[PDB]
Amino acid sequence: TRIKKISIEGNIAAGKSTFVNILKQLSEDWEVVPEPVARWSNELTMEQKNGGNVLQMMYEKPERWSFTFQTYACLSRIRAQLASLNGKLKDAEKPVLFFERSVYSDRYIFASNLYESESMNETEWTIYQDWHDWMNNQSLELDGIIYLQATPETCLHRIYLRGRNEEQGIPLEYLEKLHYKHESWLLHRTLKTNFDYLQEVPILTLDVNEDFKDKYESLVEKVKEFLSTL
Amino acid sequence: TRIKKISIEGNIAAGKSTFVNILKQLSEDWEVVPEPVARWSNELTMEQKNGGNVLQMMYEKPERWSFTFQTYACLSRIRAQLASLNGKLKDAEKPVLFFERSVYSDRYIFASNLYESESMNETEWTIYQDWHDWMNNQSLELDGIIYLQATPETCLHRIYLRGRNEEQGIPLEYLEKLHYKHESWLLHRTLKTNFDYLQEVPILTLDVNEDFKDKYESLVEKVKEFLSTL
Ligand SMILES: CCCN(c1nc(-c2nc(N)cc(N)n2)cs1)c1cc(-c2ccc(S(=O)(=O)N3CCN(C)CC3)cc2)ccc1C
Numbered sequence: 001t002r003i004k005k006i007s008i009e010g011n012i013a014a015g016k017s018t019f020v021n022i023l024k025q026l027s028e029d030w031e032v033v034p035e036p037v038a039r040w041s042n043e044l045t046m047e048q049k050n051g052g053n054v055l056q057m058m059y060e061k062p063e064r065w066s067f068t069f070q071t072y073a074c075l076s077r078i079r080a081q082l083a084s085l086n087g088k089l090k091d092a093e094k095p096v097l098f099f100e101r102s103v104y105s106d107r108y109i110f111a112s113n114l115y116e117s118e119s120m121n122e123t124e125w126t127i128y129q130d131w132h133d134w135m136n137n138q139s140l141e142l143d144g145i146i147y148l149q150a151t152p153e154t155c156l157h158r159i160y161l162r163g164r165n166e167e168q169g170i171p172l173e174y175l176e177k178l179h180y181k182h183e184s185w186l187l188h189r190t191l192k193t194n195f196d197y198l199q200e201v202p203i204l205t206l207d208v209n210e211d212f213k214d215k216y217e218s219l220v221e222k223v224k225e226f227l228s229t230l
Numbered sequence: 231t232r233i234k235k236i237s238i239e240g241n242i243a244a245g246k247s248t249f250v251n252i253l254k255q256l257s258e259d260w261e262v263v264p265e266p267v268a269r270w271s272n273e274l275t276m277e278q279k280n281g282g283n284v285l286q287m288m289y290e291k292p293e294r295w296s297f298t299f300q301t302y303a304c305l306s307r308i309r310a311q312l313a314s315l316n317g318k319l320k321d322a323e324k325p326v327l328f329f330e331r332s333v334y335s336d337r338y339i340f341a342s343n344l345y346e347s348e349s350m351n352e353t354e355w356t357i358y359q360d361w362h363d364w365m366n367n368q369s370l371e372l373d374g375i376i377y378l379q380a381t382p383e384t385c386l387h388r389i390y391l392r393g394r395n396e397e398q399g400i401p402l403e404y405l406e407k408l409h410y411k412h413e414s415w416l417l418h419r420t421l422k423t424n425f426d427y428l429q430e431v432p433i434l435t436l437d438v439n440e441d442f443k444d445k446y447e448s449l450v451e452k453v454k455e456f457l458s459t460l
């Protein structure tokens with residue numbers, strides 16, 4: 001019928017990749033769009049080569065590369081989400097496509113934070129928002145959001161568990177800032193965005209502080225209940 | 231009926247703005263889309279404020295700002311061309327929309343030159359081409375190109391005539407490089423592009439070395455003949 005679009009949102013290492021890989025196996029009517037940045041973080045596609053280069057340069061000099069990184073990350077996401085939307089689930093009874101994060105996380109979590117940290121200047125940030133408004137303004141609109149809610153401490157521990165060398169330098173303070181932004185957007189719903197429909201979009205908040213890899217049935221039950229309301 | 235899309239191409243100060251302002255007055259069926267960069271080069275729209283800032287920073291440090299400038303210039307153009315295409319000439323018998331330059335000049339003249347001058351690195355250039363392929367690949371396809379052909383010397387003289395302070399530093403050598411690229415693309419048709427239809431698109435080449443502001447009737451006659459063949 002019509003594909004339901006659900007974004008999975010949450011802090012770094014909250015368990016989004018883990019959770020979408022669990023979901024994808026439970027139904028032939030369920031597909032996932034993994035986050036391009038996540039696939040850059042390891043044959044290589046031209047996007048993966050560009051992505052790996054711009055991530056490495058980001059760790060070296062964020063105030064030079066934030067604009068180039070954020071625009072390519074967002075383009076890459078829109079391309080990947082559109083491909084799944086136009087490629088998959090045509091023969092499905094109750095099709096659901098789970099996005100690992102969204103164009104809204106790109107702008108309101110990550111790019112916003114880089115502007116706030118002076119890694120983009122005002123011109124870079126205003127050009128980025130202009131580009132985003134227009135790049136979007138031409139189908140990916142969400143039917144719902146699933147917020148995987150973990151403490152900054154849980155997330156710092158999970159960065160340690162995941163063991164990517166380049167991330168071991170990420171401090172608690174950065175995770176706390178991103179946490180505050182997620183809480184404002186998806187819990188308090190205090191964040192003003194340029195996308196009117198978002199203030200109305202249903203949100204399912206799931207506490208993922210407890211390990212769920214072998215014990216996820218209650219989380220999935222909440223997902224199925226949430227889906228039946230949309 | 232269907233709007234004919236004609237790009238006006240040529241080197242800096244060849245007389246494109248002059249020529250499109252002549253054309254627009256000759257027919258109610260004729261409209262023009264002036265080049266965004268040209269309107270940045272002087273109430274202010276957010277695009278003009280961003281544009282003026284990024285042009286000034288470009289003159290100061292092209293190897294920092296070339297990618298940001300080229301992506302915003304190309305977005306701005308696509309937005310302006312689409313607005314005219316969807317806004318204007320609905321009640322016209324023989325509608326023609328004259329583009330001041332194109333998305334192809336953006337990439338194959340200007341961005342290509344900045345890459346060739348090491349003002350973009352390989353990642354910046356590959357991300358730019360990826361973005362361009364995709365940003366276009368989703369209506370603006372040209373029915374024809376009008377090439378205003380002037381010598382580098384004519385163009386350097388016309389930069390002096392036009393008198394913009396920031397351009398008086400542009401050397402003949404830069405104009406010669408851009409001239410060679412226009413000759414390869416539009417005269418020899420040696421330039422390989424990623425847009426198959428372009429090798430087929432009709433091109434009208436007009437010699438504009440002689441001043442035409444009070445003596446343009448022969449040029450316009452060639453334009454009307456060219457239009458009748460499309
Ligand atoms: C694992 C996180 C990766 N990471 C980032 N990801 C994204 C991202 N953007 C998307 N649109 C999607 C998406 N999925 N991800 C944006 S930035 C990233 C983060 C740092 C970074 C941050 C902050 C500190 S800090 O707190 O120490 N501090 C702050 C104050 N000031 C500057 C000094 C440094 C260090 C280092 C760098 C390099 C990347 C690449």
Ligand SMILES: CCCN(c1nc(-c2nc(N)cc(N)n2)cs1)c1cc(-c2ccc(S(=O)(=O)N3CCN(C)CC3)cc2)ccc1C
Pocket residue numbers: 242265267268285288289292300303304335336337340341347349397399400401403404
């Ligand atoms: C009037 C030209 C404006 N100009 C430019 N326009 C565009 C443009 N892009 C579009 N997509 C559309 C569009 N309409 N225009 C791109 S760049 C521009 C040019 C110089 C510039 C160039 C070359 C030399 S050089 O030859 O002296 N040399 C070269 C070797 N090396 C680096 C050292 C310097 C100087 C200065 C700068 C700053 C802008 C802003």
Ligand SMILES: O=c1ccn([C@@H]2O[C@H](COP(=O)(O)OP(=O)(O)O)[C@@H](O)[C@H]2O)c(=O)[nH]1
Pocket residue numbers: 010011012013014015016017018019158159161162163210211212213
């Ligand atoms: O219940 C969980 C959820 C996640 N993880 C681990 O926490 C790290 C981060 O998870 P993930 O990659 O899914 O986080 P994302 O950044 O995608 O949110 C990984 O090493 C996971 O294996 C875990 O041990 N138990």
Ligand SMILES: O=c1ccn([C@@H]2O[C@H](COP(=O)(O)OP(=O)(O)O)[C@@H](O)[C@H]2O)c(=O)[nH]1
Pocket residue numbers: 240241242243244245246247248249388389391392393440441442443
């Ligand atoms: O036949 C002409 C064509 C142009 N110009 C002048 O040459 C300069 C550059 O023209 P234009 O702005 O049209 O060039 P573009 O950069 O748009 O090609 C301007 O000062 C024009 O008034 C001129 O004197 N005679």
Ligand code: NA
Pocket residue numbers: 023024025026027028029030031
């Ligand atoms: Na599935």
Ligand code: NA
Pocket residue numbers: 253254255256257258259260261
């Ligand atoms: Na007209």
